Write a protein that binds this DNA or RNA. Structure first.
Ligand SMILES: [Mn+2]
Ligand SMILES: [Mn+2]
Lengths: 372, 372
RNA sequence: AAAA
């Protein structure tokens, strides 16, 4: 353990996780990691998130998290001298991006003009630069996987990338099946949310719509949700009426748009790696679960969350869109750090001032039907 | 001007606005304020927001905003030296709280151990400490008004703390009129959202409920909303049925709870000054306006936003509570700064696990019916 | 407390 990595622990874990893995990628030496943290951050389990994201091996690296006062500059510098008494280390690498300005400046005054030390700073959205001894800039490109990102936030997640239909079908599914049958799709939405149908698919995996009683379809109490209309729209999308699973119904009522968005990202977006894209994702931190439609990590390590609303047209759509904007911004601002971009994708045309102004102030990128 | 105040401009304007007004309050000298900013912040109008909150006499203080690279440490140092060559200033005061770490440590190294300079740092939520020349701590208590807080964020707002009823009435309004008439209030809620009733109040200020025909009351299509039931509940609250205003209906359908929360804060809360309490305020930044029920600034200068939901009972209530939590978190995390506490007040008893877990993860303090 |  002849190389030590000194990092300051604060709310944003990415600057530390990104930096540490990068040094691991360039210099594959075994190291000891010194995380300078505080009582406040250790209560939020921040240094632990740093460990689990990189999930090194006990042999390869040693982690030590030491405590200091985040606001006493002289205490942070004094704790550093006591630790580096008659130092045996051959390479001292210091990343002053984390912590408070007090914590960073305190560590900086101790390590500046030190004989065996490299000092780095990571400006957000820019390439990592070292400040001492030589002023240099390094590219932080493709350094992090998606799993490493969410692990740094203490997030557990599951996803299902299985699509009911393939990319070639999803490129034309709107023009061929959706546009001319939106009233029939509204009937299936009523079917999907009907008390009986939602509970029977808890009991059976497939369902034969031909052998379903007719009374069950009228109990839905929606004009479009007739037995003939529902069987017809199932056939329009190319499903086997004898073997209908809940996944197929979810596809018709808008699940197609999520798969269209998901596959478009995997196949057309070149600044994102296909392996870092997830569909129908569910996150959990502190036993709080949220479902995000499509999330991905681009080559620049910025996280992108997309809320997919197939159609939000009509005035009852503006009520749905405003809730989607609030829901999206609430989730992303609380669960994720500062390096995220919010998106709302829709096939309907958003031409009303209030959602557009709300989105611009929230920072939510909208990709309208005009841009799809 | 013989005193200069150097501040770094960044996302958070409160630490600069707080500090500058404090030094003005302590020394009362005419001074020049040098705002060290960047291209990125001047696009967000940050230095403009800072000046505006203070609004000092043009004669008594002069502002100069100079630009730098937030990530170039040597460039920020050079702009400082060129500016202070043969400086005429007797007192140079430096507040390194703003800006990036690069900007902060650069400003620190330029002024550290230089004569006629005081260096300050403002840790969030603690007393302001100066680091040079003498280590000292100062109290930032009752330093900021509510108006100064919202002005520092570029927010336009209007409010009238006018209540339909007074504190003496709003204490006990629940026990005397609301608790035993919850079904009658639901009819009035249905009445408030009826197309006819909401539109006539667009044209007329008073309404005579005695000459409204019953056919208008059954068009509401709510079991409780009979003409006698609505006349009954209006008189229970003490309103004149011959001339009922929109304020009176809005009061019954939960507006009473906003006034109760507002007045309780003004009369019972020990850490907040009544002049820093606002009711039914509507904010606007960019071109997006939202309405907040009760917001106030406590004597510690932390802003408190309250979402008042009178009742969230039943399955139809959880959807309102779930939406209120997203909406609250979305606004305060996007429109306000780092030093805010979010609250949701309700008369109902919240025991459901998921909303409590959501609120705790969002950081939303909930005060249910247990704590009136 | 990657621009309290
Ligand atoms: Mn969806
Ligand atoms: Mn409300």
């Amino acid at each position: 353990k002849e190389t030590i990595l000194v990092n300051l622990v604060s709310e944003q874990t990415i600057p530390n996780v990104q930096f540490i893995k990068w040094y691991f990628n360039k210099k594959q030496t075994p190291m000891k990691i010194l995380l300078v943290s505080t009582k406040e951050m250790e209560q939020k389990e921040k240094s632990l998130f740093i460990k689990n994201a990189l999930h090194f091996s006990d042999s390869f690296v040693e982690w030590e998290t030491i405590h200091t006062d985040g606001n006493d500059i002289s205490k942070t510098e004094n704790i550093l001298t006591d630790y580096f008494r008659d130092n045996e280390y051959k390479n001292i690498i210091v990343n002053i991006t984390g912590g408070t300005k007090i914590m960073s400046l305190a560590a900086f005054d101790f390590f500046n003009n030190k004989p065996n030390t490299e000092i780095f700073y990571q400006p957000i959205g820019k390439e990592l630069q070292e400040l001492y001894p030589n002023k240099q800039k390094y590219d932080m490109f493709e350094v992090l996987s998606l799993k490493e990102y969410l692990d740094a936030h203490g997030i557990s997640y599951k996803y299902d990338n299985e699509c009911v239909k393939d990319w070639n079908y999803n490129k034309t599914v709107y023009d061929l099946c959706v546009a001319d049958n939106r009233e029939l799709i509204k009937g299936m939405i009523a079917l999907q949310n009907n008390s009986y149908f939602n509970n029977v698919y808890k009991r059976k995996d497939f369902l034969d719509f031909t052998q379903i009683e007719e009374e069950k379809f009228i109990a839905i109490n929606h004009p479009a949700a007739t037995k003939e209309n529902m069987i017809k729209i199932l056939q329009i999308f190319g499903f086997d009426v004898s073997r209908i699973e809940h996944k197929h119904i979810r596809y018709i009522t808008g699940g197609w748009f999520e798969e269209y968005v998901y596959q478009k990202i995997c196949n057309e977006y070149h600044n994102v790696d296909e392996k870092n894209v997830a569909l129908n994702v569910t996150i959990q931190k502190g036993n709080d679960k949220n479902e995000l439609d499509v999330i991905y990590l681009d080559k620049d390590n910025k996280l992108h969350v997309i809320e997919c609303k197939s159609f939000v047209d009509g005035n009852e759509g503006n009520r749905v869109l405003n809730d989607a904007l609030y829901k999206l911004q609430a989730i992303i601002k609380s669960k994720f750090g500062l390096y995220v971009k919010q998106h709302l994708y829709t096939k309907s045309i958003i031409e009303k001032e209030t959602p557009l102004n709300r989105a611009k102030e929230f920072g939510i990128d909208i990709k309208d039907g005009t841009q799809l």
